Amino acid sequence: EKFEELKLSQPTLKAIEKMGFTTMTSVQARTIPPLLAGRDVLGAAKTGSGKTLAFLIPAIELLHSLKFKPRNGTGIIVITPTRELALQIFGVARELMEFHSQTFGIVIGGANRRQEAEKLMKGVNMLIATPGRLLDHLQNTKGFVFKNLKALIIDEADRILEIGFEDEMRQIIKILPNEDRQSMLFSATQTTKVEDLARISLRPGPLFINVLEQGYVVCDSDKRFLLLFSFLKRNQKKKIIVFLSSCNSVKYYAELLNYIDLPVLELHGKQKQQKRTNTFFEFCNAERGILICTDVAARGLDIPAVDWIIQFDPPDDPRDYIHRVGRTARGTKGKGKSLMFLTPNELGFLRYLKASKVPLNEYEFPENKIANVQSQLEKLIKSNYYLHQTAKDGYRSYLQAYASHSLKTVYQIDKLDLAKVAKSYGFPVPPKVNITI
Amino acid sequence: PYEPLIDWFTRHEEVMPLTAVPEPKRRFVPSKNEAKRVMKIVRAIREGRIIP
Amino acid sequence: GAYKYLEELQRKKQSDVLRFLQRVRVWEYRQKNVIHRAARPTRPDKARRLGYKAKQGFVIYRVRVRRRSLRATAEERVGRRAANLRVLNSYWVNQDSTYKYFEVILVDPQHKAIRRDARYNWICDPVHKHREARGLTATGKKSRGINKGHKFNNTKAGRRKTWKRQNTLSLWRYRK
Amino acid sequence: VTSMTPAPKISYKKGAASNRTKFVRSLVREIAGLSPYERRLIDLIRNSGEKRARKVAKKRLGSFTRAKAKVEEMNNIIAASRRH
Amino acid sequence: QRTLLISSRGVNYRHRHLIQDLSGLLPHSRKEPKLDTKKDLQQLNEIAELYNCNNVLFFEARKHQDL
Amino acid sequence: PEYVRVQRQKKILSIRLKVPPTIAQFQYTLDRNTAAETFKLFNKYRPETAAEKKERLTKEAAAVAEGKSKQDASPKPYAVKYGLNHVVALIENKKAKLVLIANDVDPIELVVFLPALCKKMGVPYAIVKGKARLGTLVNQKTSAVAALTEVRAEDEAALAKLVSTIDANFADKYDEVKKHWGGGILG
């Protein structure tokens, strides 16, 4: 069916029109009448099917049917493992709530605690959060309007369990009310301990719908962005997609490289989704273009057969990266050459690549061929306030992305020279970011 | 008695500042208060109270 | 700013450097008079949080007192000496077995910087004559004991006040 | 008569300590050195144990929980100096 | 046995002089300066452990009226 | 007189007694040629005087008064930085490329944290001799601090070798004797 066929409030209709959605994906078209019906649900769907919007529509329907004040309650609660997925879900949800009247917020470990605290003191009518920081905010923030719980959703309980936040989740649900609460949850696969949390969460009986060499380039953390720029100039007139972690670094690298006037398309959660669709369409039809994107915005959509996969940032799911390069090779008869940047702290990832048993190719670097624009970068950052702030934001979100990373054995912040990271961003002195180290 | 000073805390060096204070706009652009004083002198010369 | 360094270093008084400076300065001030003019506050942060500004119309006296309170008497001495000045405030710096040392900020209401600059022009009012003589300073209000709390009860002068409450009788036109 | 939840006003003093003020205090600590009873106190730990150390520190102080913090602080100094 | 007598911050003078008299009574009692908290009491055990006392005595004065 | 008697009796009672090692880092200071080249550096970066400031203001204001709005272009002013809270403010970013510290301040405690603070922040501090010589290069009576951050490209190579010169001459020579209790020998 269509989104515009179903019974909806008119600002939600304007929202769906402006997000470009008319049609429905089939599994979400299945789950939406139980989503309106008020039953609990679990669901198996691929990461990036639009399954955010699938719950976003009847959640805002519930908030519209209840019309309660921002002081009145919180209601819709969203639990999501990754800070990046949290920002993507939030950025999709912003315009949806913006045509609506209610309130939207963020709770993320790695954000400023007095910020999130003051937002909770004001009250937030739709919460999106990481599991670890929720125990802090429920146990510590006073006066926060918790007793309502109109609903609750979990996304990718595989990833919560694979991180290991499930005990935190049990403490949360033991804090959570149940009788007003309905629980909806999406997870592409399932295990037993997923189902144990599901048996606690799902208050009625639910009906549920279930439907090769790599490049690796070891570089120091300062010169890696420069080498990306050099390799991108050398491979100009070849379409290449670069995978990042943080949307701020996406926007900043895109604005930077457009200031260096080589044509670059950005693709991130802060990008408006109609503009996002325009950029993806222009990349797919232009066939010689630079695409900067995060990991999971790239996960959310199928990829044309590309000259290069370049992964600059650390991965969200390395297992999904191993499956993703295999499905990329088997899907694309045109050869797509995959590479990842490495830092000399990261070589244990390589042995996990040796756990993946796929072959590996080391791609070498000449120190003579260095683009040498870093002085121009620093003069630019000392010049432009706007570029200075976007550079600081990419740096900040980059470090918070490392903070939010699961594999500590692959990534330790203690290993990293933040001076070189700042010089890669172009700062001679690393700016202060309030990060537990 | 007396004994030489222990430098336990100095020997670890901070690679970052203390405060995450955002940089102000006025550090990057030409100075505003300068220009207000300029326009003060301009208004005085337009009134002829200051001779060129 | 550097004032937080001075305050936190100031809280560690019996630390070696501060007692060294204290032991030098007590002898150095012992060379001079009972009352004299200091060029600058030796504890500038304490003077700031007591209200000092570095401009004309702010006079710093250093005063020596033998071991009322000692601090309030120290304020009364420089209040008697520089009558044209109005006493802003005072603070401890140093002491000996023989004498305690205080550093007192006084403000002149005659200087045009003080007569303008409306953060401080209130001290030009003749109701602010000799605040130390009436105990209207900070140490004066402490020794009078004027705050809010059940810990604060009728004490000495207020005791005579409530003795006054027992001493006078109130009668209306129509007797109640 | 039913309910209404106020936004709880917590003083900014009660929030936390900053990185800045911890840096300030710890940087004052090595510069100021030790006061003479602290010079006594580290030695008294090293000689006759934290029992007698806490007792002497409480005698130097007025109360007991401050003597806890003082002894724990000098233990932090010994741990910062001797191993490192 | 050794013994410890502890008061709270609440004092009236008639409320106070009894503690003096009791310290005059038991010599193995002590006359420690008064504690801050009327509410936290586990620390006193440590205090008795630091004073090697076998029975510890604590005086709570609520509102300068109740002992 | 009395004041001559006291100013001669001062610096006797100091050296007679044990000074703490956080003092006497002062007067373990920079030698002759290196301080000379440091002053040759900072006189290249004198700040603008009030007269020169007001003069340029009158020039550009007479320009706009004719109007005759010539252009809108000026790179930046570069100068030394000399406000004490401003000097500390330029640290804890860090921005101070070099700091000069006067040995003689009568409230010494204004200054005593600055060597340890630039030590932990890694800022190349140097203890200079005489705050009057600081005030001369900054159009004040005294200054007691001297921070320098922004340098033209003509002078940046001189800056780095001066930093290496100071870290050789100051940080290597006087670091262990900084820890030692100075003075104590009677007069």
Add this chain to the structure above:
RNA sequence: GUUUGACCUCAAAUCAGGUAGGAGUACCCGCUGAAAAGCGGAGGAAAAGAAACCAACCGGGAUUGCCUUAGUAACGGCGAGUGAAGCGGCAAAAGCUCAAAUUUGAAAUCUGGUACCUUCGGUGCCCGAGUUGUAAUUUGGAGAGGG
């Protein structure tokens, strides 16, 4: 360089401009104090005054004063007698300012002298004061940077 100069300190001025004292003292505020006197300091009022408050409630909301609380609580050879306060009702109602992180792309601040002017001042110029911090902005009820 045995010279010269920055400072810093301390003196001196028949230098310029100001200011303190004494009287009175009904009321006010401090200090001392017997069987009150005294001292010191002000004003038309003074003081106090914007909670490190009161409460335990369906909470209240700077200070001041009146009525009530109340001759109660409490204290006292629990003898002589001493002797409150919360709340309530009313009068009156008013709130503000510093000190903490940089303006660093320009000490932006002010006294004084002089020349004029529309003079409880204004403008200009010049000495000074001031970075050992004068301005703007911010006093938790936050606030700041940006957008």
Add this chain to the structure above:
RNA sequence: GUUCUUUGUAAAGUGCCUUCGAAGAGUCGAGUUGUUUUGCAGCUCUAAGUGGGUGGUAAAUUCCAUCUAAAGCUAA
């Protein structure tokens, strides 16, 4: 009320988003002495920063309440 001028990328306010988000130490407090009926003063000692002050509360390895001291002004 009339009348003359006042802008210079001048100053401010409201909502939303983002990034931050620093405060009164010889003080608090403790002991003693005097003084007062609990404060004040002297002498000695002398702190903390999710801190501190104060009060109820307990089904008890308690919970909750309520303010921000050690800076200042303010008519009636």
